[PDB]
Amino acid sequence: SAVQQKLAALEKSSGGRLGVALIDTADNTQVLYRGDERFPMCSTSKVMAAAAVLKQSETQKQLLNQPVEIKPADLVNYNPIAEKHVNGTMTLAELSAAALQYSDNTAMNKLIAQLGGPGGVTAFARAIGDETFRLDRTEPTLNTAIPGDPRDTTTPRAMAQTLRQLTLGHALGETQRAQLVTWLKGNTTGAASIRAGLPTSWTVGDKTGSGDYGTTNDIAVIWPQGRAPLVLVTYFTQPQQNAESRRDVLASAARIIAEG
């Protein structure tokens, strides 16, 4: 198709490997580019951890208000919110928001702990029908993004379908889904990624991810004005371990998709 020619050209110009999945919920049509290849998820995996805790709260009604200690030993490499609460507590709701909206890595590790380890996050993916997602490590090592390494990867197709189910579908209860959507819409890290390629009137909720090998990711739910929502996943990774992030590639991919 025309869009896939332009995405292929974008990929060639970038020197990296680009994976795109679009689901248009208006007719459940999909646009895929390397849709079944594995990519390192990096921080886009935080959506699955947050959703898994939200799923637990459907039975444990007070779970999101449970205070969790933040100790100095809990802090890893990037903890913009958790650092503000060292030797204090954050609720699981506050940790989920920090993980999603600020990409706080300590917050993610607390969510993983709450779920019983990376196996508990992966279990939730399996429980909602995602047989592709795998979380193997905690922060920060899940971001190593080594070429060919299957750890901590998913495919664009799988993540788009799963993000659709979590936010627009009914994999979660109504209160939990609304909370997830509110969190994604309040993301602070996405201004230069998918959002930058889309009309400024469209509402976007997204989760970015970045890692080694110049890995630059964004997954988004998009509500265009007067139009059915879209789910867009853009993964990008590069051959050099020290490569710089390329958020512009995600913006350009989104712009190419938005042309259709």
Side-chain angles (χ1 to χ4, degrees):
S1 77
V3 172
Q4 287 169 343
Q5 299 259 43
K6 281 184 175 183
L7 292 168
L10 172 64
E11 185 184 55
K12 185 176 180 188
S13 76
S14 74
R17 185 169 62 99
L18 174 69
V20 179
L22 169 87
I23 303 166
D24 187 353
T25 65
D27 49 2
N28 293 8
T29 56
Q30 293 184 351
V31 170
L32 297 179
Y33 186 79
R34 301 193 186 280
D36 294 311
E37 296 190 20
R38 290 200 169 260
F39 291 79
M41 281 183 292
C42 302
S43 283
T44 66
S45 62
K46 292 171 180 160
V47 173
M48 196 71 82
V53 170
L54 285 174
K55 169 60 63 176
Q56 293 188 320
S57 76
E58 293 176 24
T59 301
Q60 318 183 47
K61 299 300 191 296
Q62 298 314 309
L63 181 65
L64 292 195
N65 307 296
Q66 184 194 110
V68 181
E69 301 181 85
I70 307 297
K71 290 156 178 156
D74 292 329
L75 300 175
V76 285
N77 62 327
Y78 185 64
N79 342 281
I81 307 305
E83 204 163 352
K84 304 182 191 302
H85 300 279
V86 184
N87 295 125
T89 60
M90 296 174 65
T91 68
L92 281 168
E94 289 163 345
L95 291 165
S96 302
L100 291 177
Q101 296 178 331
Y102 293 87
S103 220
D104 189 298
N105 283 346
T106 297
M108 168 65 151
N109 279 352
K110 291 295 192 186
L111 297 181
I112 294 173
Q114 167 67 21
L115 300 162
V121 183
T122 300
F124 172 72
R126 299 289 181 276
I128 63 170
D130 186 331
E131 292 172 325
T132 305
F133 177 98
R134 50 183 293 178
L135 193 70
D136 295 275
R137 288 167 297 172
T138 58
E139 296 287 358
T141 61
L142 64 87
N143 302 294
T144 53
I146 288 153
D149 184 356
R151 292 177 296 176
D152 308 300
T153 61
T154 191
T155 67
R157 182 205 293 269
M159 191 60 110
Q161 296 175 332
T162 289
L163 188 61
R164 181 197 183 150
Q165 291 302 322
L166 293 177
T167 59
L168 304 166
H170 296 264
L172 301 171
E174 288 77 32
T175 64
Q176 288 75 26
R177 183 183 69 182
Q179 180 64 90
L180 181 58
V181 164
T182 296
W183 282 337
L184 292 177
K185 283 180 184 178
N187 180 37
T188 72
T189 67
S193 300
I194 285 177
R195 292 169 189 257
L198 298 184
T200 39
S201 73
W202 294 10
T203 302
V204 181
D206 78 296
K207 176 78 197 79
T208 54
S210 68
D212 287 351
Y213 286 87
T215 297
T216 313
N217 303 329
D218 199 10
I219 66 181
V221 183
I222 306 158
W223 294 268
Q225 294 287 312
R227 198 213 186 277
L230 313 156
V231 178
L232 176 61
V233 167
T234 57
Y235 286 103
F236 180 74
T237 193
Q238 302 183 65
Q240 301 295 323
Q241 185 172 45
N242 49 8
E244 313 172 2
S245 74
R246 290 293 304 277
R247 293 173 184 90
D248 61 298
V249 171
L250 312 188
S252 293
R255 192 185 315 268
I256 286 162
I257 294 290
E259 288 174 3

